[PDB]
Amino acid sequence: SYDIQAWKKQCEELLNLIFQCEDSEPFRQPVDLLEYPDYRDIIDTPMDFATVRETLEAGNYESPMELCKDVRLIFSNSKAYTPSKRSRIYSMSLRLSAFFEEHISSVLSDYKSALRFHKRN
């Protein structure tokens, strides 16, 4: 109850579910800057799900809000890159975002409740 640390394993489980999703395929590893030579002209801060997982495992997120900001960057980097809707990878981005948001909602609410309970007195 009001466990301040519970978010970390809940985010590891949610990343496992995202790796199972066929829709994560394009987002599982950093973009090859040699394959996509212009990528860093458009994208200031590359992000992918393996980087998010390793940052979590390094103990380099202090809160699930920080992890949520990096996952949302994957989705906005994909939108910044799409030429049009006529792309399988843009279709996969929007479905995976909806799945992520549906599952992260309770992780954020529970964490923020726990900080409130810790400060209650």
Ligand X SMILES: C[C@@H]1CN(C(=O)c2ccco2)CCN1C(=O)NCC1CC1
Residues in contact with ligand X, total (CB under 6 A)? 9
Q: Shortest approach of ligand X to residue 92 CB, angstroms?
A: 9
CA gyration radius, the chain: 16
Whole-angstrom Cα distance, residue 112 to residue 72? 19
Asked if residue 31 lies in contact with residue 97, where contact means CB atoms within 8 angstroms, the answer is: no
26 sits near ligand X (criterion: CB under 6 A): yes
Length of the chain equals 121
For ligand X, give the closer residue by CB, 3 or 101: 101
Give me the residues that bind ligand X (CB under 6 A), please: 26-27, 31, 36, 48, 77-78, 81, 89
